[PDB]
Amino acid sequence: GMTEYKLVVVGACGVGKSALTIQLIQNHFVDEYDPTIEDSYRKQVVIDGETCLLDILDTAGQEEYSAMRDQYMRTGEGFLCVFAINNTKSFEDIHHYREQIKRVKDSEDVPMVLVGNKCDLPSRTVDTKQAQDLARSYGIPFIETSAKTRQGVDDAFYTLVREIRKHKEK
Ligand SMILES: CC(=O)NCCOP(=O)(O)OP(=O)(O)OC[C@H]1O[C@@H](n2cnc3c(=O)[nH]c(N)nc32)[C@H](O)[C@@H]1O
Ligand SMILES: [Mg+2]
């Protein structure tokens, strides 16, 4: 089978986790996606000449059982840590997702990319420099995206795969 990358999109409710994923897979922007739905999507793509499969979990926070959260974190190879540039709280929540994933996987080296979504909106509470400082402290890539205009969407997901590849080669 071709190589599969198991990706997990995390972040506060409403940041655009679903919108980003759907834009990547289905190439359209969704105005309204039920905030309570958590499904996974698969798509064959070509990244740097490699034909591969992206298996993407679009999370929705709480689970029936917390064991289910622990399961997807352990199974996940890479994580998109998404906040919205007009939601300071979502940016502050990133600390908690970072910590929780490393905790579950019991690892200090977990492939992650920081994603500042909704960058199409003029309304902004989180400056690019603030997110850059955070990503610097984590030693991960930071990318601003818009699920609406598709700006940066492929870059976020593909960078995360490249991060996973760097991790694996060790
Ligand atoms: C609790 C939990 O975590 N459950 C998942 C539900 O939350 P999530 O999936 O993170 O959020 P969900 O993709 O639905 O999106 C929220 C709103 O923002 C709009 N939106 C998304 N991306 C963009 C965007 O890039 N720009 C703009 N302008 N608006 C956007 C979008 O339509 C929608 O109304
Ligand atoms: Mg959603």
Which residues have C-beta within 8 Å of that of residue 66, sequence separation ≥ 6?
A: none
Which residues have C-beta within 8 Å of that of residue 112, sequence separation ≥ 6?
A: 78, 79, 80, 81, 98, 101, 138, 140, 160, 163
Domain total of the chain: 1
Q: Using a 6 Å cutoff on CB, does residue 118 contact ligand 1?
A: yes
Which residues have C-beta within 8 Å of that of residue 101, sequence separation ≥ 6?
A: 10, 73, 76, 79, 110, 112
Structural domain including 8 reads 1-170
Q: What ligand 1 atom has the least distance to the C-alpha of 29?
A: 32
CA-nearest residue for atom 15, ligand 1, is: 16
Q: In what order do the strands lie in the sheet with 4-10?
A: 39-47, 50-58, 4-10, 78-84, 112-117, 142-144
CATH value at residue 35:
3.40.50.300
How determined? X-ray
Which token pair is 69? 């959260």
Ligand 2 centre distance from Cα of residue 23 (Å): 12
Give the integer Cα–Cα distance in Å for 84 and 96. Answer: 15
Resolution (in Å) of the shown entry? 1.9
Ligand 1 centre distance from Cα of residue 168 (Å): 31
Ligand 1 centre distance from Cα of residue 44 (Å): 24
Q: Give the residue from 52, 54, 42 showing the smallest Cα distance to 1.
A: 52
Query: How many CB atoms lie under 10 A from the CB of residue 94?
Result: 24
Classify 141 as helix, strand or coil: coil
